[PDB]
Design a binder for these strands. Sequence first.
RNA 1: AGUAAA
Lengths: 376, 1169, 115
Amino acid sequence: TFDGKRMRKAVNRKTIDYNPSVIKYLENRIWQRDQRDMRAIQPDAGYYNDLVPPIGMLNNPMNAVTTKFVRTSTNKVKCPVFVVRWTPEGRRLVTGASSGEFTLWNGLTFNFETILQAHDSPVRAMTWSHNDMWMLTADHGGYVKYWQSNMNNVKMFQAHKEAIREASFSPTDNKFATCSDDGTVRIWDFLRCHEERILRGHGADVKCVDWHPTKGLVVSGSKDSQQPIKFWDPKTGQSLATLHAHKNTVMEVKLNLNGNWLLTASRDHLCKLFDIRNLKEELQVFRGHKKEATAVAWHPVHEGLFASGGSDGSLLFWHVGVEKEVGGMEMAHEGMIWSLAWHPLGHILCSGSNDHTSKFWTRNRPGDKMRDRYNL
Amino acid sequence: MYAVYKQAHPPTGLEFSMYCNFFNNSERNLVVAGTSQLYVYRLNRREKLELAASFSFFGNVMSMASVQLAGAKRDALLLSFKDAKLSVVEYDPGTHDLKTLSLHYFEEPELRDGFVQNVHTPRVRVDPDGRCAAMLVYGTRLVVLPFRSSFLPSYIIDVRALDEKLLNIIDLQFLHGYYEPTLLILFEPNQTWPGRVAVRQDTCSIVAISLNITQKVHPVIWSLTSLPFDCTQALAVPKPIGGVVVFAVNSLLYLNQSVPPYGVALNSLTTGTTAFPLRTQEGVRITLDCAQATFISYDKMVISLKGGEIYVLTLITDGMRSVRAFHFDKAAASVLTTSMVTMEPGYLFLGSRLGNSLLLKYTEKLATYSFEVCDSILNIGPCANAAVGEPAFLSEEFQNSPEPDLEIVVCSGHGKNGALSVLQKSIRPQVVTTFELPGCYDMWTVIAPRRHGFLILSREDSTMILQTGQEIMELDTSGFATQGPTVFAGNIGDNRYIVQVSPLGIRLLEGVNQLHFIPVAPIVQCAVADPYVVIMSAEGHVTMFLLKSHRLALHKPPLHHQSKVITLCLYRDLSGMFTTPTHWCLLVRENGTMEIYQLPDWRLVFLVKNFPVGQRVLVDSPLVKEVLLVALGSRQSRPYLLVHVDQELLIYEAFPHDGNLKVRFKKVPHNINFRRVARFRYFEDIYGYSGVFICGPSPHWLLVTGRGALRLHPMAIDGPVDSFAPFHNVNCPRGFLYFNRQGELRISVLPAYLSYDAPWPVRKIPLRCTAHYVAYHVESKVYAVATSTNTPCARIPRMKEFETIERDERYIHPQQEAFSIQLISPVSWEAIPNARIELQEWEHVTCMKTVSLRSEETVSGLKGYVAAGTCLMQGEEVTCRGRILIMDVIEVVPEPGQPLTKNKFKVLYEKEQKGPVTALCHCNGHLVSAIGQKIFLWSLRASELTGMAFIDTQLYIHQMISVKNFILAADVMKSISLLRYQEESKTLSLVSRDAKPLEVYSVDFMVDNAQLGFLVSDRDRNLMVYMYLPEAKESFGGMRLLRRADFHVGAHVNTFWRTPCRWENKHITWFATLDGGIGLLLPMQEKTYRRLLMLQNALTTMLPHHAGLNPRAFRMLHNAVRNVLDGELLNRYLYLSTMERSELAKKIGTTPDIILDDLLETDRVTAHF
Amino acid sequence: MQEIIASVDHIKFDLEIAVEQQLGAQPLPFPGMDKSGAAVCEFFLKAACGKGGMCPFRHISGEKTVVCKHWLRGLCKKGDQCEFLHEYDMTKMPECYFYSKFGECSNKECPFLHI
RNA sequence: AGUAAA
Ligand SMILES: [Zn+2]
Ligand SMILES: [Zn+2]
Ligand SMILES: [Zn+2]
């Protein structure tokens, strides 16, 4: 029993503080036009104060290949973690487990803050709105809940009769879409909690869904190979295209913030990139996952950089236009990696796994002989 | 809502430099480019850089190159802009302007490969033989521009589709000694970063492609695959040796096609970071991170390191013409350079953005060279921070002026070139004697046996003569005529005689004694040269007098009487471009015709048929009031023509153009407003300066020096000036005289602490260290400056334990910044001794402001302290915390002999906070601090801060500014939040915020009669105005800030300040850019905005802008609410002739008078500093 | 110096008029919203809010003497119905449980009162 | 006070 009442000795806690890097970037910003005026960081341990955040290294996205292990955050009950999301300002990181619980961790020292009993069924979906005011979560029972920053539930309704796998907001907060195991995608009005359209045609349980950043377009995955990826019009509720991208279950669909790229993950051990303006051919195929690719995450700063998670516990890094992986960690987790979440600044990546742990990864420090268990 | 953008100070700071044949193939010129400015310089043999031409662009230059075309009379410049724009321009004789030869656009969406954010600048390269030019676009498209209709059709090469896939291009250079254009490309197929060099060690490659222009085939030759990971640039070695030199961070490589690679290690940081075979270069311990290099010889290279160190590199070569060794020579230290070019042998130019760019001369000394500084170009560096303060000294005659007397102090430069720039827009004369002399309207000063002996003043009925010696006393004796007014008085015969013109005749004197008088349709104007005197009657009759050896001899000029002469002037050309000392008479007739005659004879050599119109170029064959032709610059080598036409000032610059006069005149743009007594007053020496003073409602100083740049400094204090004259006296050393509108004669000298050879009168104060923040303390009238110096880093903090850095002798220590806060006295512009706060070892000052905090020991509530926020930077793995420093500047008894020591630092509050202090502000006497991801409001007690309220905020607040219990906070990645404080409940609440992400540089306010805007500067060089509109549907109940104005200022803005208009409650929001410029945002009424928007559209559509750039597209944001006018484009309307103005006004259905009234009022209300 | 040369004390801003009159304010949906980070309701204190319970602005009561420890961490579910003070006053801070129970306190920067 | 010490 943990109630915050027993005496504990003071101990210094490991931190990844971004404030020195932000200060250094603000200082360099005055007299440096671009990264070409930026002085070289030496691969030496003494250059700790020369580090800048990813916004200061737009020409070298290799800085945000988070292969340095920081901490493993584990609940006292050892429950598998299905979704991890950072708060919009990065103050905390919230995890969703199979017990229906929310667990909050500090965004700097990665220590336990508080725990909530949020759902009566495993938490599957968790997404924040673009205005940073609402956190929308869904569970395995088909219920959708609305949350505020103080983690107080203000509205609850049953969106589907079966398990909801993902949810995503529209460009504004007015509408969101949910996908479920009943094979449907449903468009919802956020304020009125009203079902607008029911998108049918997949034929099997929909595993993922994504709303376009600008256009007003909805892309969803599926289990059946006949309709693996579908494109929808939320206003009319009619299918726009069918993309036979994968021969196995599609686990992830992630539209890039540029509005041009569709990133997909599947159980056929492959990640694929598509140009939604030309769906007749694949932009790129990302090979290197030994097992199924179960999670992807675009970097918040570098638009070509994303991370990928696998059912074997591997965590690989890719860039658009590069054939092979720009980095990776075989056996980063012991079990399927369910979700990946980048810190809003982009210097920390968090992974939630089927093993009852959540791990934090940061950029490798200059002058580090990467001989640890996750590198060599 | 509606505003107009105006540029007050042009950007200073050079990024590109070259030595090419800009004007003709006989001589080469130094061509330098900043961001939107292009300059052409000649070298004068001391050595001085003389400005020959200057051009402005509606765009930012990203790359500059030159090429000699086929059958060309000069070089053509290659300028790259925006994302993918190649402009080919050339100097145009005839006119004195640029000519665009071809425009090339490569901004198709398919070339971007789906990327919407372009991080690659277009880089133009030229083949050494001039066969082709290449521009790398988006980092993946190679545009080839073949040369012989001087350009062949261009084609694009996809570098990803070559023999090897070229990714992450680092640099590209055309090689020497090939039959086809051979382009060497340094790229990184598998990218890595220094934080990860243990699993991806050294992946850098070079390839050379032979460009077959006809067949469009580009095979790869001479590949190399395992270069060090930190390769930074490549330089093509000249023809006899050939090959390429590759700069890495810690190593230097020479690569040739037929020879094995040769490289050396510049320091010990290469041991575990590259497997490339490198030998130790003995005697040198340096890095090449951001270094500029150029070839001064076929085997000699001069390198400007970061930190300013200059090295001469020698390629040691055996008989086989193969480089076998390197030699490094540590030469002088110099400025931090962004560019480097070799001029005529022995001369080297160092272009700089951070500090003054300077010209160097190198001489071989009795293999080794020594460098000396010959000239420098003033550069207000990156304007990090600015402060408005009161000038230390102002004459007591100007203390009653209703307008405030202000100056700007800016943190400029960086590092060893860090400095403070004291900037004043106008000139304030130092009055030492004022004479109340009513009645006299005109005056002249003459030299007597180079002091001035007499002061001749003319009344409506009498002439008053003042003898100016040890004391100025009226001279009532004989000599000068006193019974009537004087038309003109001046010297003649090499300052040996004095000439005086009366309405009845012309008189010659030799001091106090009249020599002879020649009676003379009353005389209305006289023009005097040496030894020619030309007088004009009221009806246009012209007679000439020659000083014959002395006496004045009448010589009747043979001038035709087709049209009567309205005005004229005499010009004596010394540096002779008036070819086909010489003497000339510029003449204006009633029919609008301007004529030039050679003065010994009277033969016509130049004619213009419509002079008063104000044509932009004057070529050979209303109500002009005065003309003055005068030569300025070094040795009077720059002739200028000044014209007064119907409340309009015309400035013309003469340039040669090939028995008529081989010159043409180019109209010079200006903002001087003119809305018989001569208005143009030439002076040869006022505080060492030569130029012309312009009288009238808006007095201005026209200064041209050996630099050759035209300087227009207003003198608006003391109101309009009626007359003006130079005055060299014992009590007035190299001063001047002028009459104000109240009939007061002031004896004045120019203040000696400012330099007037700059766009604004400036004083640069070298600090030898980086200046971060400057704050002006209104009490005690001193400046607080936060500075930093770099020291070697010796320890690695842990979490505290410190690890001593143990390395070898070839190791290079990292730089550690040590911060301090200094007091600067505006009286002498010196650091106050014993007044300096030293921050802690790793402490960084993140903000420093002057804050008004509540106190009881004051007539009002506020007190006005100086507040500084700090953070202890010790790496990513140590928790960052900081302190709040509250300091007062007190008055103490000065130390004997040190009057500066009357001011000392008084630290009131100095305590560590529970987090990093990233921003500071004051709100109704309270201290607002951003500590971590919270914002706190503090109350200052006797010695302690007490928390009043707090609120959670975004990731990192770096800027905060407040107005009337409202606070505007800016985040690094999120845009802005509007905060409100309620004193009664002690509640700090969020009013509204921008939902969309935005990388903000700084924030301020836009003030209208009742509208309050929020001005935001952008990382993409944009200015945006947000408004809180809770009644608008777009703002979902007021929780969302809506942008109502957009403007792309092609520069980063980090500091703002506000002044009222010279417009009831409108304020001008000034800013200083990181390119060294100063801009304004002036709120506008909607009707005027709409009229000037129609004018702006007409100007965009109907004008041939430089380099073919589009003014409208340049000012587009990064949807776009373009409610901001471009005043630099609106200035083009002032530059047009009257006919063109009338045509454009009729096209847009309005009146030129209305347009001018709208345009000139914006210049009037913004005449501050 | 900024307020000396460019003062705004004589200008009544539309922002000031809007915040004082709560212009554009709309009732909160989802009744249990926190209202944290929002201005207090001037109408409710002065005469009458009108909306009631659904007003976006806080309705406060003068019966709180201890600072809310959840509000400091930023996770408070009670909102206006909270029985603890939502003011940043480090004199009405809650007493330190560990100092009151287990003798000394662990952290040297403890905000709770050691009495 | 709802886990302040997980
Ligand atoms: Zn209310
Ligand atoms: Zn509470
Ligand atoms: Zn305690």
